[PDB]
Amino acid sequence: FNWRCCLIPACRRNHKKFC
């Protein structure tokens, strides 16, 4: 997982806060 989510749009949309 890591910040990979931050790079993925559909994921960072719900985990913007992660980054």
From Swiss-Prot:
Tissues expressed in: Expressed by the venom duct.
Q: List the disulfide bonds.
A: 5-11, 6-19
- One of the record's GO molecular function terms: toxin activity
Q: What is the effect of changing residue 12 to A?
A: Little loss in inhibition
Keywords for the protein's UniProt record, in alphabetical order: Acetylcholine receptor inhibiting toxin, Amidation, Disulfide bond, G-protein coupled receptor impairing toxin, Neurotoxin, Postsynaptic neurotoxin, Secreted, Signal, Toxin
Tell me where in or outside the cell this protein is found: Secreted
**Principal subcellular localisation of the protein:** secreted
Q: What is known of its domains?
A: The cysteine framework is I (CC-C-C). Alpha4/7 pattern.
Regarding protein family, the annotation reads: Belongs to the conotoxin A superfamily.
Q: What else is known?
A: Negative results: has no effect on alpha-2 adrenergic receptors (ADRA2).
Q: What does this protein do?
A: Allosteric inhibitor of alpha-1B adrenergic receptors (ADRA1B). Binds to an allosteric modulatory site on transmembrane helix 6 and 7 at the base of extracellular loop 3 of ADRA1B. Also weakly inhibits alpha-1A (ADRA1A) and alpha-1D (ADRA1D) adrenergic receptors in a competitive manner. Potently inhibits contractions of vas deferens, spleen and aorta in response to noradrenaline. May also inhibits nicotinic acetylcholine receptors with a possible distinct nAChR binding mode from other alpha-conotoxins, due to a different three residue motif (lacks the Ser-Xaa-Pro motif).
Supply the name of the protein: Rho-conotoxin TIA
Taxonomic lineage: Eukaryota, Metazoa, Spiralia, Lophotrochozoa, Mollusca
